[PDB]
């Protein structure tokens, strides 16, 4: 059997070669690719019959800037800031065979997150910093469950027992020590926490809430949008 093979060198160094044996490898890999392909539809049919959940969450950095400088004692004054989006979604519809019971979930969510991290690092030893923190989260998904039993159809819509909320700007500060992560508790003086709800539906109520501390006259402290875990939110409270 004649054997022929071709190789190529650029500047002396090579980049591969071709031969009849390479052709046989190509044929066998094409065969194996076909054999992998052929069983795929059965596998996906099986998995959809068994039912599962799928999640698509891209916590993508849109703004990052990090840095640190030396200190007069020789410590690591770390400072950075970040703004991130994580536009994910939760889906996955389970199918019950010979039961005709469908369970449907699809709840996309949007989240604008921003942090500034400040403080000191003691390298390999410890750390002491402060965290300015702002969240802006919204979500809108629907729940339904269709079941068929003895020709008795039903469309079951489960209600999220939590107040499904649409507008939220959360502004919070944190102290995260070497082995701990703590929230800075809000001021209790002039603790203005109000909630106004409207009876739009006999099961759901349209609520707007504002929780803050009225420390404007307080010195060494910023205004109402700051100086506390300020919480101005829009929700829908199920009546229970």
């Amino acid at each position: 059997v004649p054997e022929a093979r071709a190789y190529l060198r650029i500047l002396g160094e090579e980049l591969g070669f071709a031969s009849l044996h390479d052709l046989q490898l190509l044929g066998k890999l094409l065969l194996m690719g076909a054999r992998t392909l052929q069983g795929i539809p059965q596998m996906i049919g099986e998995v959809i019959r068994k039912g599962s959940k799928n999640d698509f969450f891209l916590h993508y950095i849109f703004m990052e800037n990090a840095f640190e400088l030396p200190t007069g004692a020789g410590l690591q004054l770390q400072i950075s800031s970040s703004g991130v989006i994580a536009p994910g979604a939760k889906a996955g519809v389970k199918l019950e065979v010979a039961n005709m019971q469908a369970e449907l979930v699809a709840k996309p969510s949007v989240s604008v997150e921003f942090v500034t991290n400040m403080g000191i690092i003691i390298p390999d030893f410890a750390r002491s910093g402060v965290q300015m923190n702002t969240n802006f989260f919204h979500e809108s998904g629907l729940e339904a469950h269709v079941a068929l039993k003895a020709g008795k159809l039903k469309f079951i819509i489960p209600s999220p027992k939590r107040p499904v909320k649409l507008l939220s700007g959360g502004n919070t500060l944190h102290l995260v020590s070497t082995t701990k992560t703590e929230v800075i508790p809000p001021l209790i003086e002039n603790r203005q926490s109000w909630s106004v709800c409207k009876q739009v539906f006999p099961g759901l109520n349209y609520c707007t809430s504002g929780a803050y501390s009225n420390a404007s006259s307080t010195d060494s402290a910023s205004y109402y949008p700051l100086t506390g875990d300020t919480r101005l939110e829009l929700e829908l409270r199920p009546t229970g």
């Binding site: 703004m63 400088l69 004692a73 701990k180 060494s220």
Partner: protein, 636 residues
């Protein structure tokens, strides 16, 4: 040179100081709430000679504010490392000598850690006391751990010609090291170069409060404070963030010592700053895992509020971590999760994450074509590291494909051109190829041929480290056990192995051998022409009219005619030796080109204005047999 103006001390003394510093990070508005840490140390300044300083310290206890008190007080406790922290300075002694009082030079011993180095530097900068001058405004270039700084000098209280209370005040925006240190950045965030306004958004300045004495020029008390203010995202540009760093030094005792000796170590170090990596104990990385556990919980918890926060904090801790620990723990992250691992790797601005992409690929068990493609595309990345070399070694041993091994050769070439230092990993690879080749060069045909080609690529490093592979290739050359393809591979191996004398002798041996095959002898002749000798060329000349395979003789005669035909630098140098060898010998006349091996060449020399004449060389080898009608072998 030790000027008397800077004599802020006394020879043959042991000043016992207490260094206590409090670091607090937080806000005064919310009842002055801030994370606070206390450090304490017993420093033993030892000054037997002017401008000769000897430093032993210990009793370094650190505590942290975990709770506060309703009266505003706080609570401190020991950590798990302050004891081991003590081990840092329970062992190390510092010597230093400072000429004219500004050439800060130290003598470290046993590779003192960089953080220890910089902490000592900060202590010294707190301990540096300017020479006396009768001027209320004395600004100059003073070296600190933060660089040359334009620091003034104003005496608040001077008794006669001797100052007692001195306030060393200075603004931090004026030193050399004002640039933000280049830190790990996510390459995916396209925000670049916006640091300047933020640096403007930063304010900080230092003031030290020094108490002296006109008896021994000794320092009784030192009070130093640093205050940064962060302006933006508050209101009326006054309620922003505040940072205080307060340190104090009390002179406790100064016994007389008697030692007329100052030792110096092997290192003569200035008051610069060196690169220091964000370092963290690996143990906390374990919480990382349970942190991902939270994520595992959260999807069932169906909560998305507090997710990006942990993501960033976790990758932050990551950039506080190391390499080998991460490669140890990564299989755990793989078995527990995968898309999250993708997120972390892609949102990682560290070389180690790219390094670990390779384990990711080999643990997902991806398609061989794709892994070889990525192998190539990362193989072109410059500045190789031993780690990358180790992963590529692993996946070469696991797959043993073509593109992988080519990437091995090229990356090793890159590191060889990059780092002249040849380490153990090169030896490991050389041993692996020793066990791959044995000594008879037996085994597969394509596999072993590829082995021979890659070692032909790496022969330079092979010779520079391990000539035993050279012995193996030579003994395989002077062996008939393998096929002709193996012999030709051995011949092409010597491309950048620079055959000086022994390989030339072996080639002449296997060429003048009449039993050697025609193709083998043609290859030996073609490659012997690289750097032959007048003796070898002459002997080949006399043997030519007597060798078999008249097609080989015609090929050689055509080659010599081509050599004598062209005129250049090296070809004329070779023609000189050819004429020196053509004294008592002749060559057969070439006939035909369709049935015998033929050699053709062409040269194009072009003259550039004020540059070197570029020469392009084209070669053609048309090997023919008396029973063929088409070119059986044609290498161009």
């Amino acid at each position: 040179v030790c000027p008397k103006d800077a004599t802020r001390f006394k020879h043959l003394r042991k000043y016992t100081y207490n260094y206590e510093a409090e670091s607090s990070s937080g806000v005064p508005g919310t009842a002055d709430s801030r994370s606070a840490t206390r450090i304490n140390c017993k420093v033993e300044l030892e000054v037997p000679q002017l401008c000769s300083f000897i430093l032993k310290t210990s009793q370094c206890t650190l505590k942290e504010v975990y709770g506060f008190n309703p009266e505003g007080k706080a609570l401190l406790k020991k950590t798990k490392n302050s004891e081991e922290f003590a081990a840092a300075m329970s062992r190390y002694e510092l010597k230093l000598a400072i000429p004219e009082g500004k050439q800060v030079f130290l003598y470290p011993e046993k590779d003192e850690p960089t953080y220890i180095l910089n902490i000592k530097r900060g202590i010294i900068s707190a301990l540096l006391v300017p020479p006396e001058t009768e001027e209320a405004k004395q600004v100059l270039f003073l070296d600190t751990v933060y660089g040359n700084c334009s620091t003034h000098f104003t005496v608040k209280t001077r008794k006669g010609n001797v100052a007692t209370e001195i306030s060393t005040e200075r603004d931090l925006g004026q030193c050399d090291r004002f640039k933000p240190i280049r830190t790990g950045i996510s390459p995916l965030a396209l925000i670049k170069g916006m640091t300047r306004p933020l640096s403007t958004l930063i304010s900080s300045s230092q003031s030290c409060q020094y108490t002296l004495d006109a008896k021994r020029k000794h320092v009784a008390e030192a009070i130093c404070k640093e205050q940064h203010l962060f302006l933006p995202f508050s209101y009326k540009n006054k309620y922003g963030m505040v940072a205080q760093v307060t340190q104090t030094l009390k002179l406790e005792d100064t016994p007389k010592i008697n030692s007329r000796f100052f030792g110096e170590g092997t290192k003569k170090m200035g008051l610069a700053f060196e690169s220091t990596k964000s370092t963290s104990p690996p143990k906390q990385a374990e919480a990382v895992l349970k942190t991902l556990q939270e994520l595992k919980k959260l999807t069932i918890s169906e909560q998305n509020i507090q997710r990006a926060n942990l993501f960033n904090k976790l990758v932050t801790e990551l950039r506080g971590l190391s390499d080998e620990a991460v490669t140890s723990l990564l299989p755990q992250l793989i078995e527990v999760s995968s898309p999250i691992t993708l997120q972390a790797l892609v949102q990682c601005g560290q070389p180690q994450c790219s390094t670990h992409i390779l384990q990711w690929l080999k643990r997902v068990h991806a398609n061989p074509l794709l892994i070889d493609v990525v192998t190539y595309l990362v193989a072109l990345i410059p500045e190789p590291s031993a780690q990358q070399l180790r992963e590529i070694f692993n996946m070469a041993r696991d797959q043993r494909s073509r593109a992988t091994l080519y990437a091995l050769s090229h990356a090793v070439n890159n590191y060889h051109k990059t780092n002249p230092t040849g380490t153990q990993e090169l030896l490991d690879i050389a041993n692996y190829l020793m066990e791959q080749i044995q000594d008879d060069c037996t085994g597969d045909e394509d596999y072993t041929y590829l082995i021979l080609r890659v070692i032909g690529n790496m022969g330079q490093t092979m010779e520079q480290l391990t000539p035993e592979l050279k012995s193996s290739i030579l003994k395989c050359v002077q062996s008939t056990k393998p096929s002709l393809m193996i012999q030709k591979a051995a011949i092409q191996a010597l491309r950048k192995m620079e055959p000086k004398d022994k390989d030339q002798e072996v080639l002449l041996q296997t060429f003048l051998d009449d039993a050697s095959p025609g193709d083998k002898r043609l290859a030996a002749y073609l490659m012997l022409m690289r750097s032959p000798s007048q003796a070898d060329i002459n002997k080949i000349v006399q043997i030519l009219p007597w060798e078999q395979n008249e097609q080989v003789k015609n090929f050689v005669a055509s080659h010599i005619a081509n050599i004598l035909n062209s005129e250049e630098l090296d070809i004329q140098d070779l023609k000189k030796l050819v004429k020196e060898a053509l004294k008592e010998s002749q060559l057969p006349t070439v006939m035909d080109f369709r049935k015998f091996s033929r050699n053709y060449q062409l040269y194009k020399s072009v003259s550039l204005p004020s540059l070197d004449p570029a020469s392009a060389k084209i070669e053609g080898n048309l090997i023919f047999d008396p029973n063929n009608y088409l070119p059986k072998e044609s290498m161009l």
